[PDB]
């Protein structure tokens, strides 16, 4: 529970996509499901039909997007924002995109920086890396081919972001 700050009595959404196999999807969000779906809810949405995963407005607590190992995905602002869309006011979201330190912000492939800034322009806010992770060979091509990444200065890692809720005045 402490992974993505989940709780029993809350909506958690889990996002998951090709990269995220059964396997590990499955468990993901089955732990999820009788941790949180017991006293709350759990929705489950896929990656490439985000666009139906706009149920409604501010009704998960916390949205999960591909949290897997090795995982491989790049959500923009089309897809982060149904996602802060269902996302309750001041609830989490946490989500799993490659970043190139050696490429323009916006580039093929959304960066570190364009993650953040597109992130918290997304509606979200107090968004930063969680963790790290290294590109592999099966990872990169599969990257490669479901988007085209293709680099050496490349880097797969973890970023999350918190929901502004009525409650604060920081800007958003």
Do not use: Y
């Amino acid at each position: 529970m402490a992974d993505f700050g989940i709780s029993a009595g809350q909506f958690v959404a889990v996002v998951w996509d090709k990269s995220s196999p059964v396997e590990a999807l499955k468990g993901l969000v089955d732990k999820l499901q009788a941790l949180t779906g017991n006293e709350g809810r759990v929705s489950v949405e896929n990656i490439k039909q985000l666009l139906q995963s706009a149920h409604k407005e501010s009704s998960f607590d916390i949205i999960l997007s591909g949290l897997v190992p090795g995982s491989t995905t790049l959500h923009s602002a089309e897809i982060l924002a149904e996602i802060a869309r269902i996302l309750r006011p001041g609830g989490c979201l946490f989500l799993k995109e490659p970043v190139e330190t050696a490429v323009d912000n916006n580039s093929k492939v959304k960066t570190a920086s364009k993650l953040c800034s597109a992130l918290t322009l997304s509606g979200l806010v107090e968004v930063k890396e969680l963790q790290r992770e290294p590109l592999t060979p099966e990872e990169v091509q599969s990257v490669r081919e479901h988007l085209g990444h293709e680099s050496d200065n490349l880097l797969f890692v973890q970023i999350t972001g918190k929901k502004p809720n009525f409650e604060v005045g920081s800007s958003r």
